[PDB]
Amino acid sequence: TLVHVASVEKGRSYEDFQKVYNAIALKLREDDEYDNYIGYGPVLVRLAWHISGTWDKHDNTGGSYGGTYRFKKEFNDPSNAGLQNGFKFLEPIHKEFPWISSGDLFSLGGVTAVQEMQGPKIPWRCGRVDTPEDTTPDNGRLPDADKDAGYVRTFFQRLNMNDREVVALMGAHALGKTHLKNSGYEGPGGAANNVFTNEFYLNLLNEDWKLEKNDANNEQWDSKSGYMMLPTDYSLIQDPKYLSIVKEYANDQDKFFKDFSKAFEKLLENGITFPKDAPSPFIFKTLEEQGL
Numbered sequence: 001t002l003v004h005v006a007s008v009e010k011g012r013s014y015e016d017f018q019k020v021y022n023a024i025a026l027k028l029r030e031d032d033e034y035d036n037y038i039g040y041g042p043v044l045v046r047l048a049w050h051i052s053g054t055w056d057k058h059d060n061t062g063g064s065y066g067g068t069y070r071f072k073k074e075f076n077d078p079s080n081a082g083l084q085n086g087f088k089f090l091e092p093i094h095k096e097f098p099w100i101s102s103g104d105l106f107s108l109g110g111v112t113a114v115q116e117m118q119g120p121k122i123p124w125r126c127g128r129v130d131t132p133e134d135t136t137p138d139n140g141r142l143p144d145a146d147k148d149a150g151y152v153r154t155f156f157q158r159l160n161m162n163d164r165e166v167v168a169l170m171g172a173h174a175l176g177k178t179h180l181k182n183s184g185y186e187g188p189g190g191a192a193n194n195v196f197t198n199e200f201y202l203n204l205l206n207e208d209w210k211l212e213k214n215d216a217n218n219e220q221w222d223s224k225s226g227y228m229m230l231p232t233d234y235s236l237i238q239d240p241k242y243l244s245i246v247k248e249y250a251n252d253q254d255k256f257f258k259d260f261s262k263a264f265e266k267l268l269e270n271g272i273t274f275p276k277d278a279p280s281p282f283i284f285k286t287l288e289e290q291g292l
């Protein structure tokens with residue numbers, strides 16, 4: 001398996017990264033019209049996950065380290081359709097801060113989005129290093145949505161995630177929406193789709209779901225409230241082990257926040273070796289905490 005050692009951008013420290021965080025956060029506030037006023041928060045979270053979710057624990061291919069989403073093979077992955085919006089959002093950030101690596105920028109985008117949307121603090125570590133075009137993972141490593149709980153469970157073993165980690169991570173599906181033109185699925189998972197809450201779990205348990213076909217001829221679960229769940233989302237209440245965890249997070253906001261924070265940091269760090277003398281993880285202040 002490949003070794004990717006975190007290497008701090010030369011001479012940079014917490015304050016440098018807080019400035020990048022702030023620039024992302026200010027642009028999130030400014031560019032509010034995007035996606036019928038959802039804003040860019042959700043797509044940045046999805047970008048951070050997709051650049052990380054190519055990882056394979058077996059050989060340390062893929063993962064956030066190399067920033068390989070910048071290469072055509074990966075940005076043109078059908079699984080990544082729509083993420084170009086997140087990349088374009090981050091372009092002026094990268095122009096202002098050309099010293100940050102691509103993997104650091106993409107992952108920090110996700111952290112910033114979660115926190116600015118009132119989610120948990122997510123500790124974040126710098127030191128991802130851009131790797132060459134030939135290190136770009138092939139398409140097909142990101143998950144299908146038309147599958148069942150067994151598929152989800154097996155899929156996430158490749159990312160070294162257990163049942164609790166999987167169910168926690170999936171709570172991000174409160175954010176944003178599915179777009180028919182991107183993925184063949186349409187609609188949001190709830191009402192508060194640019195605020196980070198545990199609504200995904202409450203909606204799974206409390207809505208009256210009907211298995212319908214959308215306009216792309218794909219099945220999805222729909223409620224009269226106008227919400228949807230992917231087959232993979234709904235699988236979390238079909239499987240008895242996932243169901244107990246869904247109930248736990250539906251009943252404990254703080255526990256969900258803490259578990260999501262750990263799993264999301266882990267996701268963003270998979271594949272990276274941090275030297276023993278590497279800086280401790282950074283916890284960035286929100287704009288609100290800074291009075292900005």
Ligand code: HEM
Nearest residue numbers: 042043045046049144145169172175176177178179182183
């Ligand atoms: C079985 C695993 C998963 C599947 C099958 C899946 C599938 C999907 C699909 C089909 C979409 C709609 C894309 C579009 O039409 O624009 C989506 C959106 C999204 N996903 Fe996932 N996802 C999974 C796990 C995750 C994880 C682990 C996270 C992050 C922790 C995540 C975060 C998001 C977010 C934030 C959106 C909304 C994007 C937007 O509004 O532009 N997903 N997902």
